[PDB]
């Protein structure tokens, strides 16, 4: 299985949006998630305990399926790399200011699971942007037999994102 991941990502994102009755993909983001946009999302999330929330995104594998698209034609060859760097910077800022993000979201109706809420909104906004990009590139055909040489950039940015999440996790844990 080297291609089912993309369609399963689409399906699981749709199912999660259904489960939490929220599909606000309209508010595409490039600076920082905010309660100004995701306050109702916080309220919806409070309905169900957010135990299944991870302190990382698995950047590389997460974005790997997007490479499958055929770009023989280039459009994807550069738009995808743009997206990779954008995601890298977005996660950098999110992890760097997670405390600021969580104080803000908590100020919006403090939640016992505030950290879960902030992480989930980060994940959800990223998934919305990713699905918008996937629609932008829905014309291209995903398939295996890859040879990119930009997945090396993907690996590098994934390492950077993992280190950022690592510092974030260390802060959260060490602060009791």
């Amino acid at each position: 299985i080297v291609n089912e991941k993309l369609q399963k990502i689409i399906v699981v994102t749709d199912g999660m949006k259904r489960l939490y009755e929220y599909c606000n993909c309209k508010n595409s983001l490039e600076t920082l998630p905010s309660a100004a946009n995701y306050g109702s999302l916080l309220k919806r999330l409070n309905l169900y305990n957010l135990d299944h929330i991870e302190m990382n995104v698995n950047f590389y594998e997460l974005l790997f399926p997007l490479t499958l698209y055929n770009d023989n034609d280039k459009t994807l060859s550069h738009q995808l790399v743009n997206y990779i760097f954008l995601a890298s910077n977005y996660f950098q800022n999110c992890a760097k200011n997670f405390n600021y993000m969580r104080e803000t979201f908590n100020v919006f109706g403090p939640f016992k699971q505030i950290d879960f809420m902030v992480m989930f909104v980060i994940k959800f906004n990223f998934l919305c942007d990713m699905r918008n990009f996937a629609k932008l590139i829905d014309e291209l055909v995903p398939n295996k037999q890859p040879n990119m040489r930009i997945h090396s950039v993907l690996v590098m940015r994934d390492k950077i994102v993992k280190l950022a999440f690592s510092n974030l996790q260390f802060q959260t844990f060490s602060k009791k």
């Binding site: 550069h78 738009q79 790399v81 954008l86 590098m156 950077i160």
Partner: protein, 275 residues
């Protein structure tokens, strides 16, 4: 009285426009070339030609204990300059417009055509220069320009250019939409054009394996269809005090390692790793 021993080896001028010579054997000409052209550096254009044509001046950015000094150029576009004036380096689709080829030496016109391909104009010029000595000048100019172009020619081998680096100077502005295409046009850009862009424009960030060094949190120039544009991405242009080429407070303020007033070129991430 006369003295001579044997043929001698001397320096090499590495700027393309050094090959500019008047097509006249009876009327001598000497191109104005900066002595920097005689440095075995990536720069295949001398500071004089660079400033004269692309509005750019050479500079060095000494990044460091592990100091690896790297090349960089800087703006010479005035603050009030607009439109075509802002195109720091024209593209093949507009270089004819930016450069008044009609008002310059025909050798220079041929050189610029070679840089931007335009093989049709190149062939027209060669035919005109052949059907009229002038064939010798054809040989000299075209051979030198083509030699430099093939040397640059990043999309080949045997050229000593590609370092397997993955600099993305089309990196998103972070507020534009799904776009860029600067590197698409770069792919289309001539080899000398691409190498000139690489040398002149330093990356905003330097990525080393798992290390990212930040040098400019906002790009100073952009790449678009017209080519390299000396425009601030976010609107209001930076002030550029053009000084040359083309009071008591200060006396009180003795030397304090005064910061330069220039605007170097920052754009993109430069990706290099051990793999």
């Amino acid at each position: 009285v006369p003295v001579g021993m044997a043929p001698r080896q001397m320096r090499v001028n590495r700027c393309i426009f050094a090959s500019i010579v008047s097509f006249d054997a009876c009327i001598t000409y000497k191109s104005p070339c900066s002595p920097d052209a005689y440095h075995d550096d990536g720069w295949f254009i001398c500071n004089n030609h660079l400033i004269k044509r692309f509005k750019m001046s050479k500079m060095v950015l000494p990044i460091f204990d592990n100091q690896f000094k790297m090349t960089i150029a800087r703006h010479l576009v005035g603050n009030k300059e607009r439109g075509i004036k802002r195109i720091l380096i024209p593209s093949a689709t507009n270089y004819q417009d930016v450069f008044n080829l009609n008002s310059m030496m025909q050798a220079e016109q041929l050189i610029f055509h070679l840089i931007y391909n335009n093989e049709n104009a190149v062939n027209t010029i060669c035919d005109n220069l052949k059907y009229t000595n002038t064939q010798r000048v054809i040989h000299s100019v075209y051979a030198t320009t083509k030699s430099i172009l093939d040397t640059t020619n990043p999309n080949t081998f045997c050229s000593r250019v590609s370092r397997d680096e993955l600099r993305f100077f089309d990196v998103t502005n972070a507020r534009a939409l799904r776009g860029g295409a600067g590197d698409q046009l770069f792919n289309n850009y001539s080899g000398f054009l691409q190498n000139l862009i690489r040398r002149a424009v330093a990356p905003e960030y330097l990525q080393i394996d798992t290390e990212e060094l930040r040098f400019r949190n906002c790009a100073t120039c952009i790449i678009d269809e017209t080519g390299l544009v000396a425009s601030v991405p976010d609107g209001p242009e930076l002030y550029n005090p053009i000084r040359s080429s083309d009071r008591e407070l200060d006396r009180t303020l003795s030397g304090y390692e005064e910061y330069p007033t220039y605007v170097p070129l920052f754009l993109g991430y430069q990706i290099i790793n051990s793999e």
